[PDB]
Amino acid sequence: QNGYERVQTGELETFRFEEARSTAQSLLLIGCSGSGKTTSLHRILATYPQVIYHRELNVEQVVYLKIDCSHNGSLKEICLNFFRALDRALGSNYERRYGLKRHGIETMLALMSQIANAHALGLLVIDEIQHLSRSRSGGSQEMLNFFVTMVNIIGVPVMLIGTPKAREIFEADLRSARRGAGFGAIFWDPIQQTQRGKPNQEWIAFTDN
Amino acid sequence: GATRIQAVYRDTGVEAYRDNPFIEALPPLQESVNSAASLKSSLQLTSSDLQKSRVIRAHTICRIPDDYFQPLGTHLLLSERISVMIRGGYVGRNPKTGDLQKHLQNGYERVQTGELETFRFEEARSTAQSLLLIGCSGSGKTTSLHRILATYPQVIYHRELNVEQVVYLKIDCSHNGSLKEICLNFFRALDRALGSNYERRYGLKRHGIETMLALMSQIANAHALGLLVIDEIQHLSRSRSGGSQEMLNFFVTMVNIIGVPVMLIGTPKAREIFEADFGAIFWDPIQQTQRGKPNQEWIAFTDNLWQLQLLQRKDALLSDEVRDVWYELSQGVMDIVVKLFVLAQLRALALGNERITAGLLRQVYQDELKPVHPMLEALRSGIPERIARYSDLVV
Amino acid sequence: QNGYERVQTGELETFRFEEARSTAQSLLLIGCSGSGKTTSLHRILATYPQVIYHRELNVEQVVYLKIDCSHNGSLKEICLNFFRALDRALGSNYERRYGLKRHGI
Amino acid sequence: MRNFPVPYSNELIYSTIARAGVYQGIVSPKQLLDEVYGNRKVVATLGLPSHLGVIARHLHQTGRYAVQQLIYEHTLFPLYAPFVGKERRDEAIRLMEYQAQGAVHLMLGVAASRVKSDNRFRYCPDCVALQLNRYGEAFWQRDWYLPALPYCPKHGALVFFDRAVDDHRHQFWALGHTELLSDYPKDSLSQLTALAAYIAPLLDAPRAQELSPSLEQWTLFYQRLAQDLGLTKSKHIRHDLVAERVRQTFSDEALEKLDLKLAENKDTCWLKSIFRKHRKAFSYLQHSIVWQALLPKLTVIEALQQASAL
DNA sequence: ATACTGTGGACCAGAACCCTGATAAATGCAACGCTCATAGCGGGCAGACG
DNA sequence: CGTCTGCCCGCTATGAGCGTTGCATTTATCAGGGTTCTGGTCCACAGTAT
Ligand SMILES: Nc1ncnc2c1ncn2[C@@H]1O[C@H](COP(=O)(O)OP(=O)(O)OP(O)(O)=S)[C@@H](O)[C@H]1O
Ligand SMILES: Nc1ncnc2c1ncn2[C@@H]1O[C@H](COP(=O)(O)OP(=O)(O)OP(O)(O)=S)[C@@H](O)[C@H]1O
Ligand SMILES: Nc1ncnc2c1ncn2[C@@H]1O[C@H](COP(=O)(O)OP(=O)(O)O)[C@@H](O)[C@H]1O
Ligand SMILES: [Mg+2]
Ligand SMILES: [Mg+2]
Ligand SMILES: [Mg+2]
Ligand SMILES: [Zn+2]
């Protein structure tokens, strides 16, 4: 109010009111099956508590959350996996209230953007992103748009894990390729016995122990 | 939702803006000399930060993309157009001299008879104007709009009246070109910017689509909505059977009949919708050379970006080779230019060589930017046949 | 055919063929209690055989029918007593067809 | 509710609530009742409304409009406020701030005449031109809905149309000019127009807020006026000279229209009851007629001040 | 001066709106079925090497 | 030129959105009582006729 009054009087030339948050960060982890992409995450995220309770406020900060894609390639079941997983992280029930059949995808995608801010989530990792292609629910352009509008709403960072056949899903346009490699892209490879002109040391270290 | 601001009325020097409260409660227009400096932003970099630990110097680098903004030539033109088309949509909706009340009486017929061309009065005119923005992906359409619209108070309250003026609003299309889920998006944004509950009042009583389209244009006049922005208009191509034309006509009726200005943002792929059937602005990536001499915009951008380093053994100044490889890899798209710098610094910290060279830039580009390679390769080729698929350049 | 559009329209004065005509009359009977207004009517109408089945056609002529007014004076019960008394003397089921559905008077 | 309109100058709160649902596109009356009030048991009333306070809550931020201003400026309360007396005025004011509708009518016993009459929606076609050329809106005005005068204090007769307030109990109706235009001239009486002009300035008078006499003040005022006037018997009326003055001032047709026809033959007459010791409050018409016939050069406010001071 | 006409005043009973209870009729909401797009397998039928 | 290789192709199962249905709830109708309210009524008193 003081800034507005002073800029209307003429003392101050410029003032900046409240603004909007930027698009959420995103990461892509791609590697062959059997390389250890689930074990690595489950050991890295195990050092963080899941639910921290704050006494001065009244929020139960859910630090991370893990769900997985559906075999249909359906877009409405990865909106119910969210509620189902969050009812196990906490003791609450949300799939009974917000998981009705009247609500569409565009309404569930906005209902899950409020319980992700009541409990301040830190991550949302989606596993087995390979199962998206060849879905009878809709076309490829009806999911390449669902991902863009899901990144542009929730506010929490997202991590995507999949096999090397998921490159062609996210490499169809610049709008989705820019968002897929939002904070870099990690490609994993099997261990090599010979590194440059000398035997590998990582292989020997792994085998001896 | 948003903090309300008690209005103080100013004295506009324009004859047409005589006694309209809605455009005297607005902040004053600014000259172009300071409009190119009211948007600039940068990160602090206290001189004692170069001696901190590696983890802190790594978590400080990551905030460069979110806090660095540089105003360009086109931002001034866009800001002036937005200011004019915001302050010019209120002259036909004066609340004092019985002119807004002639619009709210007409709207009850439209919601009552279910038609948007029903009129009771004939001297209630509307002036709105319109705009359309088109540019390649990553060019900076939304981050340079949230920054422009950040100088306005949004909700304003008048005590002489009992009206809450909502200066601007922003929504986006559905993932399919649906019809019932744009009205609900409008209601959700409206009652998230005010704190009310209109989604339970309208749109949950099983109304037909025409009734919803009629109710959407009345609650947008109860609060004097100065500007409406629809983001990602390219989602309209996947609409239902013949539904693409319906909302394309509807966004024309509001500008022409009701009076609410409308702005549309999209990619070059969305040009085909309008070609089949609004002013046009076209945005393109930075070119290194356009006059036969080096572009001053590119030099200024790189020179201002280079001064944001936390590396201990930082280079004295940016050499020509580093600039040339930086343009070669990035080709001028805004997002890659900053992200490449951030990743190069993040790798230089952990690798141990706290410097930046051309080879490090090439190695980071090869390793960590795999999915973006074909589009930049097509841009570097400069062949229209290759760009005919993706790469988002208008022919 | 005239009666189908009366069902569709809801107005009982419409017509399609002008040649269709009615040739019916009306009667009213009043008397003090104990006079015998019910048993005498039953004895008179017991001469006719009610349901008669025709072979060249496929109709089943119903010579007469008797109902009574509801005690409550309701308008929806006089139209249900008719169906009950009709399917009691035929063995059919018309109350489920017509009475059960949500219909205005 | 977020945007409740401020009342226009000289408007009943019924029109304001009616416009508060035209400005926002609410069609079904039940939805409007559930939004504005929160109950579906409220009854729409033109003149002397109840349930006030929720209306003042909506206009809270605009600091001027409170319950007192709404009661004394945008209703028909000042017509009944001074004549009832000091005893029941405060109780009625307290009652109008809560959810007791019929109790207010009972407390204002002059308005507690059981079933009312002439509930049709009145209007004056000449004033609507000014309303449209000044505000852009058309609304019910307190001049039109006088308790017994279907006349406008500045133009003449009122054009009725046959829609009743009690026809739909829960519906708030707003005037529309396209439906409105049904003007046709009617018979007019100049005496009743002059009476309406005389009685009009009582509505916008601040004196009626804090000044009200009592029954014994009324009878003392009447007896002093009769004694000083000189046309009296021994501590009684002549019963002929006062009636002759009333007939000279006002015709018999006017009193027949006003439902106060003079009855010389019968012992029970409203004028005779006025002269005798007061037992119940009387309407504004009888007091106005007595004042005009007996004081032909004094204004309403000063006459009330004279009656109340002594 | 004292007995009769008129009148002031105190006053009961018809009656109108409010509260209570029981039964019939008009909506609103949670549940269920209709329709349209999308993907694919396997068998039956136009042109092959023999 | 016909059966195998491609091609057609009718068919089948699945899911998200829209339109329809039955039950419970609200709303309306009607009779009964009642309790104060007020509206006209009769009695006692002052002032006037023998
Ligand atoms: N003038 C600028 N100066 C600095 N960074 C900029 C500038 N313009 C854009 N950016 C960067 O651009 C990124 C934001 O990209 P967006 O504005 O969302 O692009 P976009 O137009 O929204 O792409 P889409 O997916 O088609 S909507 C951030 O990393 C900003 O730092
Ligand atoms: N002609 C008759 N001969 C013999 N018994 C008769 C005769 N007429 C009437 N009855 C007797 O009277 C009774 C007939 O009256 P109901 O059948 O009860 O009808 P009701 O006279 O119309 O009375 P309602 O229907 O209640 S007004 C029976 O008990 C008969 O046995
Ligand atoms: N770095 C490692 N050290 C030891 N074991 C490993 C490592 N990476 C993977 N494994 C083993 O590989 C097995 C399969 O890994 P998994 O979690 O299935 O990865 P993915 O789901 O990507 O195939 C696990 O049981 C784990 O024991
Ligand atoms: Mg796995
Ligand atoms: Mg964007
Ligand atoms: Mg009988
Ligand atoms: Zn008038």
Would you state the structure tokens that stand for residue B262, as one six-digit string?
């409308």
Question: Which of the ligands is closest to the CA of residue A35?
Answer: 3
Residue A197 annotated as lining a ligand binding site: no
For residue B55, with 0-12 CB atoms within 10 Å meaning exposed, 13-18 middle and 19 or more buried, which class applies? exposed
C77: the nucleotide nearest its CA (via C1') is E24
D93: phi > 0 → left, psi -120 to 50 → alpha, else beta; which? alpha
Beta strands in D48-174 (DSSP E): 120-121, 151-152, 156-157, 161-164
Chain D CB contacts of B101 under 8 Å are 135-137
Q: Which residues contact D112 (CB under 8 A, 6 or more apart)?
A: D105, D106
Q: How far is the CA of D251 from the C1' of F47 (A)?
A: 36
Give me the helix-helix angle, B358-368 and B334-351, nearest 10°.
Answer: 110
Say yes or no for a CB contact (<8 Å) between A148 and B368: no
Would you state the structure tokens that stand for residue D109, as one six-digit string?
């016993």
Is residue C80 classed as helix, strand or coil in its secondary structure? helix
C-alpha to C-alpha distance for A137 and A149, rounded to whole angstroms = 18
D148, D76 Cβ separation under 8 angstroms: no
Nearest atom, ligand 3, residue A36 CA: 19
User: Looking at CA atoms only, how far is residue B30 from chain A in angstroms?
Assistant: 8
A145 touches chain B (CB under 8 A): yes
Q: How far is CA D138 from CA D126, D128, D147, D155, D179, in A?
A: 12, 6, 21, 17, 12
Dihedrals φ, ψ of B229, to 5°? -125, 125
Say yes or no for a CB contact (<8 Å) between B175 and A146: yes
Q: Are strands B281-283 and B130-135 parallel, antiparallel or unpaired?
A: parallel
For residue B203, with 0-12 CB atoms within 10 Å meaning exposed, 13-18 middle and 19 or more buried, which class applies? buried
C-alpha to C-alpha distance for A140 and A163, rounded to whole angstroms = 18
User: Looking at CA atoms only, how far is residue B231 from chain A in angstroms?
Assistant: 11
Q: What share of chain C is helix, strand, coil (3-state, %, to 5)?
A: 30, 5, 65
Would you state the structure tokens that stand for residue B325, as one six-digit string?
């490889």
Q: Which of D2, D4, D136 minimises the CB distance to B102?
A: D136
Q: How far is CA A85 from CA A66, A95, A108, A125, in A?
A: 7, 10, 15, 12
Instruction: Give, for ligand 2, the residue of C39, C43, C44 to mutate: max count of ligand atoms closer than 8 Å to Cβ.
Output: C39
C-alpha to C-alpha distance for B285 and B295, rounded to whole angstroms = 12
DSSP labels, D42-59: ----SSS---TTHHHHHT
Technique used: cryo-EM
Measured on CA atoms in the order B135, B136, B139, B141, is the torsion positive or negative?
positive
C-alpha to C-alpha distance for C57 and C44, rounded to whole angstroms = 28
Chain B CB contacts of A106 under 8 Å are 174-175, 178, 181, 184-185
B5, A4 Cβ separation under 8 angstroms: yes
> Considering only CB atoms, which residues of chain D are within 8 Å of chain B?
2-6, 22-25, 27, 31, 35, 59, 61-63, 134-137, 176-178
Q: Which residues contact A143 (CB under 8 A, 6 or more apart)?
A: A73, A75, A132, A135
C-alpha to C-alpha distance for A182 and A164, rounded to whole angstroms = 18
- Residue identified by tokens 């990035």 is B330
**C-alpha B2 chain-centroid distance:** 19
B78, B281 Cβ separation under 8 angstroms: yes
D139, D11 Cβ separation under 8 angstroms: yes
Q: Which helix (H) or strand (E) holds B360?
A: helix B358-368
Gap from CA of A23 to ligand 1 centroid (Å): 10
Would you state the structure tokens that stand for residue B251, as one six-digit string?
């966004």
Is residue D132 classed as helix, strand or coil in its secondary structure? helix
Resolution (A): 3.3
Q: Which residues contact A71 (CB under 8 A, 6 or more apart)?
A: A131
Radius of gyration of chain C (CA): 17
Which residue has a Cα nearest atom 16 of ligand 2?
C36
A135, A3 Cβ separation under 8 angstroms: no
Question: Which of the ligands is closest to the CA of residue A40?
Answer: 3
A136: the nucleotide nearest its CA (via C1') is E38
Residues with C-beta atoms within 5 A of ion ligand 4? A 38
Chain A CB contacts of B154 under 8 Å are 17-18
Q: Are strands D161-164 and A60-62 parallel, antiparallel or unpaired?
A: unpaired
Measured on CA atoms in the order A172, A173, A179, A184, is the torsion positive or negative?
positive
Say yes or no for a CB contact (<8 Å) between B215 and D25: yes
DSSP labels, D232-246: B-SSSB-SSHHHHHH
C-alpha to C-alpha distance for B149 and B169, rounded to whole angstroms = 10
C-alpha to C-alpha distance for B213 and B197, rounded to whole angstroms = 18
Nearest CA-CA partner of A134 in A177, A78, A72, A68: A72
Would you state the structure tokens that stand for residue A46, as one six-digit string?
């195990």
A98 touches chain B (CB under 8 A): no
D219: the nucleotide nearest its CA (via C1') is E8
B68, B305 Cβ separation under 8 angstroms: yes
Q: How far is CA C60 from CA C21, C44, C46, C49, C90, in A?
A: 22, 22, 18, 12, 9
Q: Which residues contact D207 (CB under 8 A, 6 or more apart)?
A: D301, D304, D305
Would you state the structure tokens that stand for residue D160, as one six-digit string?
């009725």
C105: the nucleotide nearest its CA (via C1') is E25
C-alpha to C-alpha distance for B75 and B188, rounded to whole angstroms = 29
D18, D174 Cβ separation under 8 angstroms: yes
A18 touches chain B (CB under 8 A): yes
Q: Which of B27, B238, B374 minimises the CB distance to A8?
A: B27
Q: Which helix (H) or strand (E) holds B166?
A: strand B164-166
Give binding residues of B for ATP as ranges: 135-142
Q: What is the DSSP letter of B307?
A: T
Three-state SS for chain A is CHHHHHHHHCCCCCCCCCCCCCCCCEEEEEECCCCCHHHHHHHHHHHCCCEEECCCCCCEEECCCEEECCCCCCCCCCCHHHHHHHHHHCCCCCCCCCCCCCCCHHHHHHHCCCHHHHCCCCCEEEECHHHHCCCCCCCCCCCHHHHHHHHCCCCCCEEEEECHHHHHHHCCCHHHHHHHCECEEEEECCCCCEECCEECHHHHHHHHC
B310, B49 Cβ separation under 8 angstroms: yes
C-alpha to C-alpha distance for B297 and B287, rounded to whole angstroms = 9
Nearest atom, ligand 2, residue C39 CA: 17
Q: Which residue is nearest to nucleotide F47 (CA to C1')?
A: D234
C-alpha to C-alpha distance for C13 and D168, rounded to whole angstroms = 32
B368 lines ligand 1 (CB under 6 A): no
Which of strand E's nucleotides are less than 7 A from any protein C-beta? 7-9, 11, 16-18, 23-26, 28-29, 32, 37-40
- Residue identified by tokens 């508590």 is A49
C-alpha to C-alpha distance for B236 and B244, rounded to whole angstroms = 6
Q: Which amino acid is at B263?
A: M
Measured on CA atoms in the order D200, D206, D209, D213, is the torsion positive or negative?
negative
Give binding residues of B as ranges: 135-142
* Beta bridge partner(s), residue A198: A195
For residue C42, with 0-12 CB atoms within 10 Å meaning exposed, 13-18 middle and 19 or more buried, which class applies? exposed
Residues with CB under 6 A from ligand 2: C 33-39
* Beta bridge partner(s), residue D151: D157
